[PDB]
Amino acid sequence: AQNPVERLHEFLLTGARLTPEKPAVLELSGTEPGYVSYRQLANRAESYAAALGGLGLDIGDRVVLESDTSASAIAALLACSSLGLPFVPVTPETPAKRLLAVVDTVSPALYLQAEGGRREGLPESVGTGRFGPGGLVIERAPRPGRGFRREVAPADPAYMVFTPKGVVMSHRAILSFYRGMLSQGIVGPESRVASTAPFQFDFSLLDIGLALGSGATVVPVPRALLRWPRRFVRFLRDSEATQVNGAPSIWRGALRHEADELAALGGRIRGVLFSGEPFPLPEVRALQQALPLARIVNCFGSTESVAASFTDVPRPVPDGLTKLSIGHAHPGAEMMLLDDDGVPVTEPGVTGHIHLRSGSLFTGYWGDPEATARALVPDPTNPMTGQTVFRTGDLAHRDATGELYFDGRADNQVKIRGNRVELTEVERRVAEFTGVAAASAVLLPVLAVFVELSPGAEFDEMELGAFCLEELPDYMAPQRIHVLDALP
Numbered sequence: 132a133q134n135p136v137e138r139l140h141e142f143l144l145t146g147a148r149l150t151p152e153k154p155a156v157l158e159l160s161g162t163e164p165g166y167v168s169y170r171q172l173a174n175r176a177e178s179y180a181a182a183l184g185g186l187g188l189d190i191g192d193r194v195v196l197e198s199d200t201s202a203s204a205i206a207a208l209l210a211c212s213s214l215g216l217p218f219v220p221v222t223p224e225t226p227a228k229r230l231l232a233v234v235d236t237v238s239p240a241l242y243l244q245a246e247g248g249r250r251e252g253l254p255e256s257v258g259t260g261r262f263g264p265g266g267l268v269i270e271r272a273p274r275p276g277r278g279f280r281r282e283v284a285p286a287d288p289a290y291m292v293f294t295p296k297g298v299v300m301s302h303r304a305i306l307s308f309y310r311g312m313l314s315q316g317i318v319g320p321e322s323r324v325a326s327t328a329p330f331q332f333d334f335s336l337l338d339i340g341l342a343l344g345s346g347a348t349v350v351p352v353p354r355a356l357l358r359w360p361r362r363f364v365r366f367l368r369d370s371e372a373t374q375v376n377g378a379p380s381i382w383r384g385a386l387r388h389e390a391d392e393l394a395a396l397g398g399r400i401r402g403v404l405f406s407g408e409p410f411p412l413p414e415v416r417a418l419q420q421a422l423p424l425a426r427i428v429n430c431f432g433s434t435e436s437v438a439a440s441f442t443d444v445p446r447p448v449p450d451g452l453t454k455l456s457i458g459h460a461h462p463g464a465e466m467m468l469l470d471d472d473g474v475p476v477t478e479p480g481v482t483g484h485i486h487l488r489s490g491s492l493f494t495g496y497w498g499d500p501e502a503t504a505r506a507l508v509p510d511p512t513n514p515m516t517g518q519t520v521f522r523t524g525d526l527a528h529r530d531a532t533g534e535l536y537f538d539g540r541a542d543n544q545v546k547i548r549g550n551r552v553e554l555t556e557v558e559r560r561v562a563e564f565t566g567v568a569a570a571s572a573v574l575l576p577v578l579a580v581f582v583e584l585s586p587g588a589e590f591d592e593m594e595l596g597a598f599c600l601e602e603l604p605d606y607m608a609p610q611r612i613h614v615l616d617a618l619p
């Protein structure tokens with residue numbers, strides 16, 4: 132209590148000093164359900180730290196963490212955080228190719244996966260280990276670090292999330308976001324927060340901070356369940372979840388095929404949170420009706436600050452509302468609307484480019500200062516301070532009451548399975564296939580690319596599909612290729 136909380140693990144474990152016996156994270160012990168309590172979570176966390184802290188690792192050395200969200204994964208990140216080892220979450224569904232690209236660029240001292248983890252193939256240069264309820268065990272010792280660093284500063288890295296582009300987030304950035312979000316009273320200490328995102332998104336951490344920072348319980352939702360809407364609803368039933376967080380699309384199956392079962396949870400679920408994509412209004416209304424007690428909140432923003440705004444979906448949604456609002460920044464934040472020349476937009480209803488100023492901003496992109504300098508630009512409203520501000524690439528306009536409406540992107544960034552895809556990079560790659568002169572990508576959800584053959588060339592459908600995968604991930608592969616004579 133005498134100790135001020137300026138680091139990630141010190142924040143998420145406050146419940147271990149105030150409410151030690153409260154259940155912190157739901158956890159399956161074989162087939163017998165249990166709960167890890169704030170105190171127990173803290174013990175696993177330090178049990179892990181002891182195993183880690185004797186390995187010669189310096190503060191700043193990176194560690195890869197391969198797991199679905201679970202109490203042991205939280206323990207691992209807590210431990211990493213306790214040692215100033217920034218951590219890189221990765222989800223077990225991750226393609227070999229993609230993982231070793233992350234390992235390669237971030238050059239971590241150590242890789243760790245779940246007890247059950249069936250991963251192999253890591254460089255001998257990289258330490259290897261495992262974790263679960265029974266403890267943390269190292270297999271291949273990591274090379275020791277410099278033995279030079281001595282204290283963890285709020286500006287130091289806490290974690291990095293990878294799109295390969297890593298967003299590097301300090302201890303402060305993540306605590307300002309946590310402090311912004313909790314100011315909204317989305318949840319209480321009796322809440323059971325069902326977390327759906329993959330551990331490799333940002334969103335998982337948002338879920339964990341929401342629950343733990345509110346004294347609540349994290350309910351890890353096994354992702355398997357998303358393609359079995361009934362099994363997914365029974366899971367929410369039996370876990371007795373009261374808050375459910377996820378991309379809008381987690382609800383699609385249940386609203387479409389299982390609305391009766393879902394509405395059987397209507398008395399227990401008091402909140403639902405979404406970010407990433409807009410929620411289509413038909414479905415939002417459906418969900419409001421199936422869950423009549425639920426406060427539905429639209430979380431808008433970006434990994435580069437986790438997020439920015441939390442905005443209540445009105446109940447019911449007025450009939451001629453085509454878009455939900457994204458509100459205004461949480462306390463201590465501001466999304467400024469600027470024009471093309473960075474001049475402020477003061478007129479309501481005029482679209483502008485959101486520039487975010489907060490205590491939450493990413494430190495930079497890993498090993499990519501040029502991108503970092505394009506994203507965190509000097510503050511156009513007051514550039515002489517030295518202060519930097521985040522050029523989001525998102526457009527919006529404000530109404531006369533001061534609320535924001537998302538107008539889409541200024542570039543061609545798109546979302547596919549929640550992963551940021553720049554459509555111009557699909558186009559460029561397709562265009563470097565021989566016999567293609569130009570391409571145009573577009574989303575309809577499905578990704579199509581339209582292509583204009585160079586003069587003379589014959590064109591092989593599948594040869595392109597495969598050629599794209601050579602350097603584009605699976606979510607960036609076209610599902611539909613259409614040849615044309617020319618391009619409008």
Ligand SMILES: C[C@H](N)CC(=O)OP(=O)(O)OC[C@H]1O[C@@H](n2cnc3c(N)ncnc32)[C@H](O)[C@@H]1O
Binds near residue numbers: 405435523540546550
């Ligand atoms: C918690 C998580 N980090 C949120 C997120 O989506 O992270 P990120 O992968 O970094 O997505 C960035 C973009 O998604 C879009 N977005 C984001 N939330 C919304 C929204 N609620 N409505 C509409 N568009 C949105 C905006 O384009 C954002 O610029």
Ligand SMILES: [Cl-]
Binds near residue numbers: 459460464465466467
């Ligand atoms: Cl704002």
